[PDB]
């Protein structure tokens, strides 16, 4: 039995290293949003709330985790707060991650009414509510769902704890049925699965809208060939009627003028077609190629460019949520083994603290994702560092 302070010194040193990196990186995130007006959107307000939770992981949760690893004597409910405050920060992260996913879905599903629905004032109120809910969820053991009424008195006596005190150890005070059923299943796993469902809807809507743009572009060019290879005025009319409906469908200053010309030129050729003037209608329909090459094609490429940027932004948000799941799932899975398999030997000490360190590492990764995937963050990061 090697001296416990040796393994403890390694765990504590790693925790402190994580705390420094979590504070430095996420302070840089909040500083960037504060300085850059181009970063001051509703999505990044939840990014700031998420960064604030990770700053608090380094300032409070990691010092709390170091303290509870010692098993020091404490009043049980005070021990509960040390043990459960990190659950508040994790729950706040979940609410921020879910809000970001919903915000990205609203922006791609109904972009016409996004600015009227998703505002900064409403976002700040949602953030405040979610922080209150995170305290209620994370500190639910302090409301009575704890093991303080049944303290391990032999462990407390062996450590010389005073009357009314317990050896402050996580699994001694926090019930595992709370950790598995309430915290993990209901409050972590279900919202993460909801996020997965939201992101599936986002990318499916992106693929559908990109296909609709390509369908309107092909229908525009196909019916142009139909008019050229037509023989009577009726065939020209059928092709022009489908072009006009598709032109107004794709329409949903330089953008409006381009479609004003297109629909007007379609109406010109339609009127000639209704008069039986096939040659004159085809010549008028050939003028549509000038409007297509000078206006319509530019709108197709810009609308495609906008959707691809929304896909890129939605993937950046999905990576953050996936990394949260990857960093926290091992610790939750270990709790499931402890809870559901009492015949299984408890996960060893080194693995417990590896899972704890890994969960804390998640408070370091998000500033790197923003730097590698978001040019506006990366450029603002460089300006802050150089200055
Ligand atoms: C605003 C921020 C910075 C203040 C941080 C306050 C923290 C550090 C305080 C608030 C409540 C405190 C706990 C309250 C009760 C107990 C029980 C006692 O038997 C041992 C200490 C212990 C476990 C305290 C540890 C420190 C503690 C968690
Ligand atoms: C900004 C908001 C969250 C205010 C933060 C204040 C919180 C962290 C402080 C304020 C008063 C504190 C409590 C004061 C007294 C006790 C009784 C003790 O037996 C256990 C700890 C406990 C329960 C403290 C836990 C932490 C506490 C709840
Ligand atoms: C989310 C991704 C990273 C998958 C994580 C898988 C990890 C958390 C899984 C894979 C294998 C698992 C271990 C397999 C077997 C045992 C022996 C048992 O007596 C206690 C639990 C313990 C020690 C498990 C703990 C959790 C474990 C380490
Ligand atoms: C929903 C998916 C994507 C991720 C969550 C998977 C979790 C809930 C699953 C994956 C592996 C599972 C464990 C695998 C094996 C055992 C050993 C058995 O004696 C009791 C249950 C227990 C401990 C399972 C509990 C639930 C578990 C931890
Ligand atoms: C002992 C424990 C004490 C610790 C106490 C923890 C309290 C939780 C703090 C949350 C800060 C929230 C971060 C602020 C993010 C809000 C984003 C924002 O400011 O948006 C502005 C608005 O949207 C424009 O109109
Ligand atoms: C830097 C701050 C140092 C904090 C010092 C924390 C003391 C760790 C400790 O005593 O562990 C007790 C048992 O877990 C076995 O060692
Ligand atoms: C700066 C913001 C605050 C950060 C503070 C971090 C310190 C972590 C909490 C440290 C908790 C102190 C542990 C304690 O009280 O031990 C003595 C008992 O055994 C007496 O019975
Ligand atoms: C407490 C932890 C740090 C919380 C950091 C507080 C958040 C800083 C505010 C911020 O950076 O955002 C400004 C806002 O976007 C303007 O519209
Ligand atoms: C800015 C905030 C400063 C906080 C520093 C945390 C330091 C925590 C100090 C904990 C000392 C506990 C102690 O000395 O306990 C001894 C034992 O309980 C009886 O001999
Ligand atoms: C989302 C997935 C949920 C599945 C989680 C269910 C895991 C719980 C199964 C463990 C269990 O039921 O164990 C029974 C007990 O071991 C008998 O002795
Ligand atoms: C005998 N063993 C010695 C080592 N002990 C380690 C106690 N620390 C600990 N233990 C657990 N189970 N969790 N779960 C969590 C968590 C937080 C969020 C989701 O999960 N944190 C934890 N911290 C366990 C007993
Ligand atoms: C731990 C489970 C918590 C369940 C509690 C349910 C109530 C929470 C509801 C929150 C929605 C908040 C919207 C209303 C805000 C109005 C504030 C006001 O009166 O000005
Ligand atoms: C992440 C990078 C590697 C992580 C290494 C640090 C984590 C665990 C090694 C510690 C060995 C034993 C832990 C003892 C914990 C304790 O005494 O309370
Ligand atoms: C990083 C600073 C190094 C601190 C090492 C931890 C030793 C404290 C201890 O275990 O008692
Ligand atoms: C994770 C680490 C990123 C740290 C980048 C260093 C710059 C810090 C500047 C600051 O604290 O505002
Ligand atoms: C530890 C907690 C530190 C949190 C770091 C958050 C920093 C980011 C934004 C806070 C607002 C900045 C206030 C100073 C403004 C000065 C100026 O405008 O030039
Ligand atoms: C910027 C402010 C950040 C706060 C710095 C906090 C750093 C201290 C870290 C851990 C404190 C651990 C206290 C140890 C518990 C007592 C051990 C015992 O009594 O057996
Ligand atoms: C503010 C920055 C933190 C200041 C000082 C860190 C010193 C932590 C001392 C912990 C003592 C542990 C013990 O005595 O058992
Ligand atoms: C449930 C907990 C309730 C907390 C009250 C927080 C105040 C937020 C009101 C603003 C809501 C909003 O603008 O959408
Ligand atoms: C962030 C805004 C604050 C919202 C807080 C809402 C949830 C509060 C939950 C638990 C606080 C319980 C404090 C415990 C009292 C002392 C217990 C005791 O002495 O035995
Ligand atoms: C919907 C979110 C609202 C926030 C939570 C509601 C307020 C909770 C009220 C009181 C909590 C009191 C803390 C309990 C003290 C000691 C209880 C115990 O011995 O376990
Ligand atoms: C997503 C929902 C996640 C988990 C569903 C929970 C079902 C667990 C049943 C518990 C089995 C038992 O009581 O032994
Ligand atoms: C619980 C399983 C993990 C769920 C994480 C969902 C976050 C986004 C992931 C993928 C989007 C495609
Ligand atoms: C490398 C990081 C950890 C890798 C794999 C986790 C599996 C460890 C399982 C060891 C068995 C524990 C036991 O003996 O009860
Ligand atoms: C990101 C996934 C994390 C896995 C990376 C593995 C790195 C750390 C692994 C092991 C260090 C902990 C000590 C392992 C051997 C200890 C055996 C023992 O003390 O009984
Ligand atoms: C012990 C501290 C581990 C730090 C976690 C690493 C997070 C991001 C890593 C590399 C980005 C380049
Ligand atoms: Na987090």
Curated annotation (Swiss-Prot):
Disulfide feature: 73-161, 76-148, 79-168, 341-344
Please give the GO cellular component terms listed in this UniProt entry.
Answer: asymmetric synapse; axolemma; dendrite; glutamatergic synapse; intermediate filament; membrane; neuronal cell body; plasma membrane
The organism named in the record is Homo sapiens
The UniProt gene name for this protein comes to ADORA2A
Transmembrane segment boundaries: 10-34, 45-68, 80-102, 123-145, 176-200, 317-340, 349-372
Segments on the Cytoplasmic side according to the record's topology features: 35-44, 103-122, 201-316
Q: What is this protein called?
A: Adenosine receptor A2a
List the glycosylation sites.
156
Post-translational modification comment from the UniProt entry: Ubiquitinated. Deubiquitinated by USP4; leading to stabilization and expression at the cell surface.
Biological function: Receptor for adenosine. The activity of this receptor is mediated by G proteins which activate adenylyl cyclase.
């Amino acid at each position: 039995g090697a001296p416990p302070i040796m393994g403890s010194s390694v765990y504590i040193t790693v925790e402190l290293a994580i705390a420094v990196l979590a504070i430095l990186g996420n302070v840089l995130v909040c500083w960037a949003v504060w300085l850059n007006s181009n970063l001051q959107n509703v999505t990044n307000y939840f990014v700031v709330s998420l960064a604030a939770a990770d700053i608090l992981v380094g300032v409070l949760a990691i010092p709390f985790a170091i303290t509870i690893s010692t098993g020091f004597c404490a009043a049980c409910h005070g021990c509960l707060f040390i043990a459960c405050f990190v659950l508040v920060l994790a729950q706040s992260s979940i609410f921020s991650l879910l809000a970001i996913a919903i915000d990205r879905y609203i922006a791609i599903a109904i972009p016409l009414r996004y600015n009227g629905l998703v505002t900064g004032t409403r976002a700040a109120g949602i953030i405040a509510i979610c922080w209150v809910l995170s305290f209620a969820i994370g500190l639910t053991p302090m409301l009575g769902w704890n093991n303080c009424g049944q303290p391990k008195e032999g462990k407390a006596h062996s450590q010389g704890c005073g009357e009314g005190q317990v050896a402050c150890l996580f699994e001694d005070v926090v019930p595992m049925n709370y950790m598995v059923y309430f915290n993990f299943f209901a409050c972590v796993l279900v919202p993460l699965l909801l996020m997965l469902g939201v992101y599936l809807r986002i990318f499916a809507a992106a693929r559908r809208q990109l296909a609709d743009l390509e369908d309107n572009w092909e229908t525009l060019n196909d019916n142009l060939k139909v008019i050229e290879k037509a023989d009577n005025a009726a065939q020209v009319k059928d092709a022009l009627t489908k072009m006009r409906a598709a032109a107004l469908d794709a329409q949903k200053k330089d953008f409006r003028h381009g479609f004003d010309i297109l629909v007007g030129q379609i109406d010109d050729a339609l009127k000639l077609a209704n008069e039986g003037k096939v040659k004159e209608a085809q010549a008028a329909a050939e003028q549509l190629k000038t409007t297509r090459n000078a206006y319509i094609q530019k709108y197709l490429e810009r609308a495609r460019s906008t959707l691809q940027k929304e896909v890129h932004a939605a993937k950046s948000a999905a990576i953050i949520a996936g990394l949260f799941a990857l960093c926290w799932l091992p610790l939750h899975i270990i709790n499931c083994f402890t809870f559901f398999c009492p015949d299984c030997s408890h996960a060893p000490l080194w693995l417990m603290y590896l899972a704890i360190v890994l969960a804390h590492t998640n408070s370091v990764v998000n500033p790197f994702i923003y730097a590698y995937r978001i040019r506006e963050f990366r450029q603002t990061f460089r300006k802050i560092i150089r200055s």
